[PDB]
Amino acid sequence: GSHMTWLSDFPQAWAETGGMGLAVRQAPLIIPLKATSTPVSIKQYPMSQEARLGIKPHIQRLLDQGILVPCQSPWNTPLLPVKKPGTNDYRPVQDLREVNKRVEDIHPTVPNPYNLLSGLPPSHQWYTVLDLKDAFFCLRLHPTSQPLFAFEWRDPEMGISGQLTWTRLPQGFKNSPTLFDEALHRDLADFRIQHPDLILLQYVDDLLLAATSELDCQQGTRALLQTLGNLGYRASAKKAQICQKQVKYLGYLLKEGQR
Amino acid sequence: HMTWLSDFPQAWAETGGMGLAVRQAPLIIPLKATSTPVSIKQYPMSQEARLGIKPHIQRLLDQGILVPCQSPWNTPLLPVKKPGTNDYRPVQDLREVNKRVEDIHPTVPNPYNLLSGLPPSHQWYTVLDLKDAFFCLRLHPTSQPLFAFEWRDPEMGISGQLTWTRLPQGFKNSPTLFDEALHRDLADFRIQHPDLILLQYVDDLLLAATSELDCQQGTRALLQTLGNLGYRASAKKAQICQKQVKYLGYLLKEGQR
DNA sequence: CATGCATG
DNA sequence: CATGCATG
User: What count of other Cβ atoms lies within 10 Å of the Cβ of residue B19?
Assistant: First the structure.
């Protein structure tokens, strides 16, 4: 149709119009520690006022959304101000290595990008590719697990005088990809059943919907967006590839052939 | 009916846990322009009272509804009672805090004027009350300092104060902020169900339908919507699809009492 | 920045 | 054994 019509018919489905997501059907996650792990408090590396100002907006947006909350924890990991090469564009990166080492690994069951796409039958050649924005943040952390990802932050304006931590699955945590992948799979099982004429590929927060015609792809995408929104997820409108015979997915490019 | 608790896990507190209004962003509480922090010292309480209350504080702590803090503000924590031998419940005297917070217009219905506008045509009702309603709304970090109170406890690792991360009890504007929050959230539901009459008084709801079937279809949709929005109803108190129910202290069968 | 590992 | 760099 247009892209704008897609934005208009599904405001709750896109991160750009429906605010940040939160998976309503997902119970708070408990992060099991290794049998012998004990809290570790890695001190915050000194940070220049310039770098701090540079990442302040990132922290603020999260605080305003309740994604970051104040806490007092025996755990602590460094907050790193990563500045884009040749610019004054900063972004925060939390070094969670010491926490990851004390958390038990979860054998990732995420499918191989290649096989996933290699299964698509030649009968379904119309595609819609979406990627959920701030995916991990849509999954809540049980309060007993929140203390694990604490970091230092100071700002009188926000009434923060010590530490903050995440209420959602953090970026940088080793099991986030698989935990999210499994969550979205559970949440989309119903959709798959309601649409036997459609193929749905999903790799963590990346989705590819395949149909036999532009019409079926159109109607399937409407259903998918409505389902994702109701479920509490948010797709990136700016990056979406709706109803095309040629799309980019998981690094792979599929036109009527592959990459 | 046992299908209600099995079919709608997210809508009931028992199966869905502490709620959290997903459409409602953490709340900022505006202080009056003249206001200044108030520090009221904690009145010492019997070691027997600090026991019957200890569990509450602990439970909130563990759910993250309470958090340690250092704040310029401080209000009393009162050891209330009950007929029982050891039934002490927390009561925070937020009066000095309320006097310093900017007032907001009362938008809550008048109790009775709510039922007065109830068509005789709708005689099938469902009464639901939301559990821990105010707690579904979060407090922005910037406004959390306002509600702090003293609890030095070695056992849990508290060196001084604790404060709320959710809309607290005793805060003058809690009833109004929740009522307005729930009203906005259930608006789409009202529009999509014109043949249904929905009354809302803070955390007390009453759904009215023309027939038993309509009530059941309506109730299923309401619970589904509440769950998705993050609210939680008390399945234990719920009166589902029946012509005689009690709502807002009003007994209403086929003739209001 | 800190640094874990595949890599020669 | 030494080290480039992807990733926290």
Answer: 23
